[PDB]
Design a protein around this ligand. Sequence first.
Ligand code: CHL
Ligand code: CLA
Ligand code: CLA
Ligand SMILES: CC1=C[C@H](O)CC(C)(C)[C@H]1/C=C/C(C)=C/C=C/C(C)=C/C=C/C=C(C)/C=C/C=C(C)/C=C/C1=C(C)C[C@H](O)CC1(C)C
Lengths: 37, 60, 51, 34, 236, 67, 221
Amino acid sequence: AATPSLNNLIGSVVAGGLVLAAIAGAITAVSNFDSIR
Amino acid sequence: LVDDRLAGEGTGKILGINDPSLFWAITIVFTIVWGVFYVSTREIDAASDRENDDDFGLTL
Amino acid sequence: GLPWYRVHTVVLNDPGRLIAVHLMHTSLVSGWAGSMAFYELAVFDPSDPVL
Amino acid sequence: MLTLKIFVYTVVTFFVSLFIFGFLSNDPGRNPGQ
Amino acid sequence: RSGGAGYRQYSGDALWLPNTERPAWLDGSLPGDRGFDPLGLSRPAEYLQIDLDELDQNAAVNKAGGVVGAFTPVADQVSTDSLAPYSEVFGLQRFRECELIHGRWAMLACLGALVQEGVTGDSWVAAQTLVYNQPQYAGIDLPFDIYTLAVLNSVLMGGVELFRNSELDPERRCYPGGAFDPLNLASDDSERTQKLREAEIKHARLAMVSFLGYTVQAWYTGEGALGSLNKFANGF
Amino acid sequence: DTGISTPLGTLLKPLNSEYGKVAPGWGTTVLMGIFMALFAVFLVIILEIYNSSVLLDDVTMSWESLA
Amino acid sequence: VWYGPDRPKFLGPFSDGLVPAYLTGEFPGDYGWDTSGLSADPETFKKYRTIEVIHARWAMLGALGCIFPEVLEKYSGVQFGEAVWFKAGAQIFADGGLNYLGNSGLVHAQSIVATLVVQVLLMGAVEIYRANGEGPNGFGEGQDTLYPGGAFDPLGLADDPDTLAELKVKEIKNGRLAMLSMLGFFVQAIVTGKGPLDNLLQHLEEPGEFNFYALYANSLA
Ligand code: CHL
Ligand code: CLA
Ligand code: CLA
Ligand SMILES: CC1=C[C@H](O)CC(C)(C)[C@H]1/C=C/C(C)=C/C=C/C(C)=C/C=C/C=C(C)/C=C/C=C(C)/C=C/C1=C(C)C[C@H](O)CC1(C)C
């Protein structure tokens, strides 16, 4: 009984996680590649 | 009649005991307080540093 | 001298008087609720619940 | 109302019983004199 | 007689996996020790002590507290504190008392749910509401209104559990004995005592899982213990 | 200097004893972050239902659901 | 005061020419009354002392138990099937059986044989423990067979030995009064046919008119 509006809300939550994962992944990569000390 | 009331006022009842429950209330409370008093009499007197003999008591 | 806007900071590190100070606000808030209800009951007209 | 009367009778008896056995508890000795 | 005919008498320490090692904190002395602690809840916990933050407004600088040292508190130490008797929450012996108390309650509950369903015909979940509206046992109506029973249940269980908490010896908290072992079945330090204690944790763990089954089945199927059993048979 | 001792004070004293004790490192922070993320999603869903940006068949989201 | 040679005695100022030699005052309730010489034998005197206290403890329970239901039915809302003590046994033959406090949800006993079987089992075991001096697994071994104390004194009211001697006199004196009053309960039940509480209220209504001599004396012969 999932309406199409409910699916997009779930899709938006997943897309939001991917954006956060992409941000964290890029930051962790550059932080490790360009490290102090 | 229209309503219900105790109808004990001005009837000359002993201690105002319209029902026996009042008798139990007075008796139970008094016995309890007398009970705790009874077990403490010896201690209360011991403070006098004197035995409660025939000569005991605040006298002049 | 302590500024007027920091007076109630004396119970910042006094747990005993912090409870006492929080008990006073609680006393006032419940005091307001009782006072407010009694006023409203003195002004409220229950005769006409529809209009 | 009867519940009220019994409650009051219990309360009145309790305080009167304290009064009676309070003075029977060597009250005359409860004094600062010597 | 010997044997070694219909069975493989392999030698090893019975653990929860066919091959694995006991955790260092799980020696195997306790009854039912199967080396099962993947989360390490009974691992002796290590804590750091932070110093008291400076909150004196008479001082120019109020620096927050820093690590004042690392300490591993000794667990399984009962004290006279009524509200928090044990020294640490994460102790093996405190958890075993929790395991036994949770387990013994589940054993009574698992049997109690079955018996009242087979005697009264009412589901154990629906039983709570029925007794609430009409206090009754075995079909006989009890002579006490529910309000009194509610207070009595809290007061009686309150006294009962306060008596339980008086004990200070950690082993005796899990195994009081005395009046609770009138037959003296496992009051000595024999091997029979160890075996009896091993049976108790097994039945206790079984009942904890079993009653977890009752509640989930009641949530999902909507039936009680015996009712869920009948539903499954008909499902075929 | 020990302070006033009261029967209720001794009873509650164990609850105010481990002032500075902490778990070393990050402890259960990652577990906390999981629940915050689930809570954030839950808050979003109920916000969308009230905002009508999510339409559920059973819910009507109007005064008429008082019937 | 209650022990030794200067104890109070049953004939007051004339109780000096009949106090037996063996009644010295080492036991509670000793007023020097053995005018029939039934306790001349020291061993028999020991057993009679046990029987007296046992008869006394039962009478104290009996006197309170024989009048408490009648007090409750008259001066409270409780409605027993039969409050009067000498009619209370027939309650078990009633249609609803015997209901404690009149409530059908309490006890609700309906077979006399089941009650009797339970009693002879429970009383039989308890009386055996008292007779033998030890309960199951030697529960009361080494305790006095008349004054066990210990588990039978949960409040520790007899820890002081001097308080024990005083309290023993209170037990036997209340018990003797209960034994005498139970004799009154028996005879008054036979003569009057009313409950003991009903008899008391009859005396209080008009003592000069409602007593044994003005109501029943002429009929006994
Ligand atoms: C232990 C002492 C004891 C005594 C003194 C009595 C006395 C009595 N029972 Mg009773 N019972 C006793 C124990 C028990 N009864 C019962 C079960 C019943 C039933 C089912 C009934 C009675 C009834 C009666 C009464 C018969 C009417 C009568 O004879 O009136 C005239 C006599 C009197 C009023 C005076 C009674 C005094 C007694 C004759 C002398 C006192 C000393 C005794 C000999 C004590 C002996 C103790 C021994 C056996 C250990 C009566 C007053 C009947 C009843 O209630 O009738 C309405 C009845 O139906 N009893 C049980 C459980 C099985 C008992 C257990 O211990
Ligand atoms: C539960 C809420 C709460 C609590 C417990 C506190 C507590 C505290 N605040 Mg604070 N504050 C709050 C909310 C709160 N604040 C809010 C919402 C704001 C934004 C407006 C501020 C802005 C604020 C500032 C700027 C400062 C504090 C400061 C302080 C500390 C000293 C307070 C003082 O002695 O001033 C004393 C106050 C008076 C002597 C008179 C108050 C009269 C005001 C102006 C109006 C009267 C209000 C009325 C009587 C009650 C209505 C309140 C109710 C409707 C909510 C103290 C520990 C001071 C601080 O940090 O100390 C270092 C400080 O500088 N607060
Ligand atoms: C036995 C205590 C008790 C009881 C039974 C009541 C009962 C009542 N109070 Mg009263 N009150 C009390 C104590 C009590 N009060 C105390 C101690 C105070 C002093 C602070 C007050 C101050 C007070 C005021 C000012 C008012 C009332 C009012 C009322 C009436 C309406 C309550 C209502 O609908 O508001 C609704 C209550 C809430 C919405 C509470 C919301 C809870 C918040 C959202 C907590 C959420 C955060 C939480 C920590 C989340 C974490 C927990 C979660 C994870 C499980 C009601 C009859 C009102 C009234 O009618 O006036 C007479 C009124 O205005 N009371
Ligand atoms: C000292 C001397 C000296 C010289 O030398 C000689 C001589 C003289 C001989 C001597 C004397 C003696 C005497 C006096 C005796 C008496 C006795 C008695 C009376 C007892 C009772 C006794 C009595 C008793 C026990 C009683 C008991 C009772 C009881 C349990 C009860 C029960 C019951 C109840 C509750 C209720 C119900 O409903 C009914 C019944 C069931 C019924």
